[PDB]
Design a protein around this ligand. Structure first.
Ligand code: N5A
Ligand code: MG
Ligand code: MG
Length: 210
């Protein structure tokens, strides 16, 4: 069973700005998604201090980058706190705790899209390079869910079965046809070293089987 939701208007507007603004420095999407993963890892790390059983779903705190040229996907995986169903809907579908409004105003006042993470909306930079984004997530004490959107003002949520994660989040970027440079090992390595070199968790770049 698939549920379909409308983005909050301001989030739809933000996504359209990201999709339609001419802006060549697209590579910053990866730093923003890695940063979100790092935040999620900080959160489960902290919660596990006072409740060690929260790591029963996996003790290792890390980030995996998985390119697949056959599927034309780049997946950012973490073993962070994950998201409940309500978290998915609120945190990806609405302004929530973010500086969405401040960012859109800033872009009219000299700011540029690379500053998106300063406003807590870095997730949407995925749409610089992806035509569709799928988010698979598992939080302690909720079930596994799949969130999905190709923008256009709506997203879907369904339960996800058959490939259970222990705990965390997978952001699957279905890349635009002209953005396949981000599947190349040397390109990914270059971007991680440039923008994500101080992240306090291991980042493992998977090798392609083909
Ligand atoms: N809708 C405004 C932007 N807010 C978010 O993208 C929020 O979604 C959640 N989020 C994004 N990527 C995540 C991730 N990899 N793990 C856990 N939560 C994540 C965070 O709460 C983040 O602040
Ligand atoms: Mg938020
Ligand atoms: Mg928990």
């Amino acid at each position: 069973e698939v549920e379909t939701f409308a983005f909050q208007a301001e989030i739809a507007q933000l996504m359209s700005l990201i999709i339609n603004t001419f802006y060549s420095n697209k590579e910053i999407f990866l730093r923003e998604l890695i940063s979100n993963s790092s935040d999620a890892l900080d959160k489960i790390r902290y919660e596990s201090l006072t409740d060690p059983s929260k790591l029963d779903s996996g003790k290792e705190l890390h980030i995996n980058l998985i390119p697949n040229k056959q599927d034309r996907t780049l997946t950012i995986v973490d073993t962070g706190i994950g998201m409940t169903k309500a978290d998915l809907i609120n945190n990806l579908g609405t302004i929530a705790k973010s500086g969405t409004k401040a960012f859109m105003e800033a872009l009219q006042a000299g700011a540029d899209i690379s500053m998106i993470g300063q406003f807590g909306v870095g997730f949407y930079s995925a749409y610089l390079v992806a035509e569709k984004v799928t988010v698979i997530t598992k939080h302690n004490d909720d079930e596994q869910y799949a969130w999905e959107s190709s923008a256009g003002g709506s997203f879907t949520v369904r339960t996800d079965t058959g490939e259970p994660m222990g705990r965390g989040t997978k952001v699957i970027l279905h890349l635009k046809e002209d953005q396949t440079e981000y599947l190349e090992e040397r390109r990914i390595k270059e971007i991680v070293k440039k923008h994500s070199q101080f992240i306090g968790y291991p980042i493992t770049l998977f090798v392609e089987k083909e």
